[PDB]
Design an enzyme around this catalytic site. Structure first.
Site, PDB file in Angstrom:
ATOM      1  N   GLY A 116      29.240   9.204  23.726  1.00  0.00           N
ATOM      2  CA  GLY A 116      29.997   8.022  24.078  1.00  0.00           C
ATOM      3  C   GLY A 116      29.705   7.703  25.519  1.00  0.00           C
ATOM      4  O   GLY A 116      28.963   8.433  26.174  1.00  0.00           O
ATOM      5  N   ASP A 117      30.277   6.619  26.019  1.00  0.00           N
ATOM      6  CA  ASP A 117      30.059   6.251  27.397  1.00  0.00           C
ATOM      7  C   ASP A 117      31.319   6.545  28.157  1.00  0.00           C
ATOM      8  O   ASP A 117      32.403   6.575  27.575  1.00  0.00           O
ATOM      9  CB  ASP A 117      29.689   4.785  27.498  1.00  0.00           C
ATOM     10  N   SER A 146      27.580   8.857  31.011  1.00  0.00           N
ATOM     11  CA  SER A 146      27.569   8.912  29.557  1.00  0.00           C
ATOM     12  C   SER A 146      27.839  10.331  29.086  1.00  0.00           C
ATOM     13  O   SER A 146      27.276  11.288  29.614  1.00  0.00           O
ATOM     14  CB  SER A 146      26.215   8.436  29.016  1.00  0.00           C
ATOM     15  N   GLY A 147      28.724  10.453  28.105  1.00  0.00           N
ATOM     16  CA  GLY A 147      29.056  11.746  27.547  1.00  0.00           C
ATOM     17  C   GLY A 147      28.088  12.087  26.428  1.00  0.00           C
ATOM     18  O   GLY A 147      27.135  11.351  26.159  1.00  0.00           O
ATOM     19  N   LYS A 165      36.648   7.333  27.958  1.00  0.00           N
ATOM     20  CA  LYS A 165      35.474   7.607  27.148  1.00  0.00           C
ATOM     21  C   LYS A 165      35.609   6.772  25.896  1.00  0.00           C
ATOM     22  O   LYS A 165      36.661   6.799  25.239  1.00  0.00           O
ATOM     23  CB  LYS A 165      35.423   9.091  26.768  1.00  0.00           C
ATOM     24  N   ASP A 221      26.462  23.469  25.700  1.00  0.00           N
ATOM     25  CA  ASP A 221      25.779  22.517  26.567  1.00  0.00           C
ATOM     26  C   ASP A 221      26.179  22.880  28.009  1.00  0.00           C
ATOM     27  O   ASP A 221      26.722  22.050  28.754  1.00  0.00           O
ATOM     28  CB  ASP A 221      26.185  21.069  26.200  1.00  0.00           C
TER      29      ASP A 221
END
Lengths: 292, 286
Positions: free
Chosen positions: B21-22, B17-18, B38, B128
Site C-alpha cells: 500500500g502507499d 510506500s509500504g 496507509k 523483511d
C-alpha cells in the site's frame, strides 16, 4: 471532646502525606505507644490501603520493615496503624544542611541496597525509591534504616514459579521523576534494575546536594537526565558511584542483580578510605559542630 | 476542496510506500497530531491491510510497537492510520554520512534483537528485516527503536498448540534481496533463524557501509552472498558479529533461538570497550 480512632488509638497532628493519603501521629492509649496512623476515606475512587496493608503483612519479619499495629475501619475511613519511626533521610539531609559525608553515604548505601534486596526476594519491586521513603529507627534500632510506603509497589514475578513479568510498556502509576530510572521515562515496565538505578540517583543526590535536572517539566527532566552523561554527573567523586550507576543501566529487564557486587564496591572503598564501621553518622557529629 | 479521509484526517504528502500500500502523511484534524495513513484500494485480488492491521492490534502494548489510531472504509480505499514515528535507521545512517560508530551499532543491536524476540513471542516472523523498517520514536521516546510493517509477517506456529509450521521448499524470495538470508535465496520456507540472520546483515551493513552483493540481479546477489565467507564479511570488526551470524546460520528450521545469548555477545563487547550507558548516538554528535 478528644478525637479517637477505633477503640484505643488517640489521633494527633498530621505528620505528613504519602501515596495512600496522609500519616497522622497517634497514641495507643491502651499502652502509651505513639504510633503512626494512615487514613483513607471510603470513596471507592481508587481504594488502596487494603493492598499496601497486605504487602506490609507479607514483608513482615524482615529487617527494616515497619510492624503494622492494627487495621480496620472508622466511619468514612480505612485505618492502618503502624510502628512510628525516627526521621527520614530527607529530614536528616536537611538537618545536616543538605550535606552528607562519604562515610555517611556509604554507611547508608550499604543498608539501602539490602532493604531493596529483601523487597525483591519477596517478589515485589518498590517503584518509588527516594530519601523520603527511608526512615531511621528509634532507640535500640536508631542505627537501622527502614523502607516505607508500598503504595506504588508491584509484584515482579509469580510467587511460586517465579515467572517474571513480560517486557511490555508501562500502564501504571509512576513515582518521583527526579529519581526515576531512564526506562521509567521511556515508558517501559519497571523491574528490579529500576529500583537500583533510582538508588544511584539518591546517592548522587546525597553527594551533590541537588541533581542536575532538579529545578527546571517531565519532558525536560527526561531530556536533561538522558543528556547528562554518568561520568559528568559523578564528576569529582569516587568512581564507585559512576560504576554503580553504569552497572544498573546495564542490567537486562529480567536480570537478577548482583547485590553482593554492589555492596562490595562501596565496602572496599570504605576500607580504602580508612573509615570504621561504627554507626556514627553525620547527624551524630553535628552536636559537636559539624555534620560534614 | 481539502482532501479528508473518514472525515477525521486530512491527507498529506505521500511519505513512502509500504509492503502492499502507499503511505501518506496525515493530520488528525481534531487533535492536531500528525499521523501516518496507509491505503489499500478496495479492488485488489490480494487484500493484506485487514490482516496487517490485525497483527498490530495483537502486538499492542509491546515496547517499540506503533499504535494503530483508526481503521476506516472510504469509497475506493481501506484505511489504516497509525502513529507517525521518527526517521528510519536508513534516514539517520544516510544523515550520518553512512558511518555508524561501534557503540551506536551495539546500542541499536540490543534494541533491534528485542523487537524480533517479542515478535517471535507473539507467534510471528517478520520476514523483511531492514534498516528501513526500524524507526526512532518521538520526544522522550526518541531513543527507542520501533519495528514496523507487518505486510509480510507470518505465523510460524499455531497459537495454542505452538506446533511449528512444516518444512517446505520451492518458495519465493519474499522480502528484500539485499538482507535476505541464504535459506531464503534457496527457496526454503522461512523461520525464526531467518529474521535473525537478516538482522546480521543489517548490523554488518551498518559497520561496513555497504555489502559485497550490493551494487551488481537477484541471482548475482545470491552468488556473492554464498561465495563471501563470514570471516571475510566481518574482517576487521569484533568477532562477535561473526559469532552472531555463525550462530544464526547454524540454527535449524524449528529451532527456538537463544536471543539472550546473542544479546550477551554485544553486551560483553559493549562492556569490554569500556563504553558507558548514555543515550547519545552518532546523530546527536553532529
Amino acid at each position: 471532646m478528644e478525637l479517637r480512632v477505633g477503640n484505643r488509638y488517640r489521633l494527633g497532628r498530621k505528620i505528613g502525606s504519602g501515596s495512600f493519603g496522609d500519616i497522622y501521629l497517634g497514641t495507643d492509649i491502651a499502652a502509651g505507644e505513639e504510633v503512626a496512623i494512615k487514613l483513607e476515606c471510603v470513596k471507592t475512587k481508587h481504594p488502596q490501603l487494603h493492598i499496601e496493608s497486605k504487602i506490609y503483612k507479607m514483608m513482615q519479619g524482615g529487617v527494616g520493615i515497619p510492624t503494622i499495629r492494627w487495621c480496620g475501619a472508622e466511619g468514612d475511613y480505612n485505618v492502618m496503624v503502624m510502628e512510628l519511626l525516627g526521621p527520614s533521610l530527607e529530614d536528616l539531609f536537611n538537618f545536616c544542611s543538605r550535606k552528607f559525608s562519604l562515610k555517611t553515604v556509604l554507611l547508608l548505601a550499604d543498608q539501602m541496597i539490602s532493604r531493596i534486596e529483601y523487597i525483591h526476594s519477596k517478589n515485589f519491586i518498590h517503584r518509588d525509591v527516594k530519601p523520603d521513603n527511608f526512615l531511621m529507627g528509634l532507640g535500640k534500632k536508631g542505627n537501622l534504616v527502614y523502607i516505607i510506603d508500598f503504595g506504588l509497589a508491584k509484584k515482579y514475578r509469580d510467587a511460586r514459579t517465579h515467572q517474571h513479568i513480560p517486557y511490555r510498556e508501562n500502564k501504571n502509576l509512576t513515582g518521583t521523576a527526579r529519581y526515576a530510572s531512564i526506562n521509567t521515562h521511556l515508558g517501559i515496565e519497571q523491574s528490579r534494575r529500576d529500583d537500583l538505578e533510582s538508588l544511584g540517583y539518591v546517592l548522587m543526590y546525597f553527594n551533590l546536594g541537588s541533581l542536575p535536572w532538579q529545578g527546571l517539566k517531565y519532558e525536560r527532566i527526561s531530556e536533561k537526565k538522558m543528556s547528562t552523561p554518568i561520568e559528568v554527573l559523578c564528576k569529582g567523586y569516587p568512581s564507585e558511584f559512576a560504576t554503580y550507576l553504569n552497572f544498573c543501566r546495564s542490567l537486562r529487564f529480567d536480570d537478577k542483580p548482583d547485590y553482593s557486587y554492589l555492596r562490595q564496591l562501596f565496602r572496599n572503598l570504605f576500607h580504602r578510605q580508612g573509615f570504621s564501621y561504627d554507626y556514627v553518622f553525620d547527624w551524630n557529629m553535628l552536636k559537636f559542630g559539624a555534620s560534614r
